[PDB]
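Model the whole thing, not chain by chain.
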Amino acid sequence: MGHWSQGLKISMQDPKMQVYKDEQVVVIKDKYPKARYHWLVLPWTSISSLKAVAREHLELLKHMHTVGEKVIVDFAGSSKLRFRLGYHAIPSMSHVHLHGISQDFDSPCLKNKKHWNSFNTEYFLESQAVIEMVQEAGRVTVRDGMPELLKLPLRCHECQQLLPSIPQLKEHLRKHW
DNA sequence: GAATCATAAC
Ligand SMILES: Nc1ncnc2c1ncn2[C@@H]1O[C@H](COP(=O)(O)O)[C@@H](O)[C@H]1O
Ligand SMILES: [Zn+2]
């Protein structure tokens, strides 16, 4: 509600933090990345929330998507890593920001069940699905009951086995390399 | 003992 909530804004203004910059968006590395590659794609024109998304933003949304992919190719093309581009249903930090994150989930910043389910349940809306939603309906359909998904038991995104803890989940992920 | 959770953060 003060200063920390503005961090994203601050870091997007910071030239050192800008991995990519153009007339519409700026892309920065996630300060507490939940994987080996984790970038945030932010529009210069602030947008409050996914509930306030219209057709006007469609050309911007596609652009953010495209830009994410560029960064993924430009800085992680050599990696044989699978990526995902999408948004959190409920952001914590102010503004809407696109997540581009590698599916290894090998990062010490991933510490609790909230993180894992925020990237591995319907709480994480894919960018393509969002874009199609604004194209088809002119608005994003966000199913109710998102905060309950954050409490769901740990399930691996590759093998699909249920796991009991963040430490055992990390060790289980290690073997998928 | 270790992991998770709830909550405050001056
Ligand atoms: N100063 C910062 N610079 C860059 N990324 C940040 C900063 N502070 C927080 N973040 C990231 O912003 C994300 C929040 O996005 P969201 O979950 O969409 O609300 C988290 O993954 C944080 O790690
Ligand atoms: Zn697995």
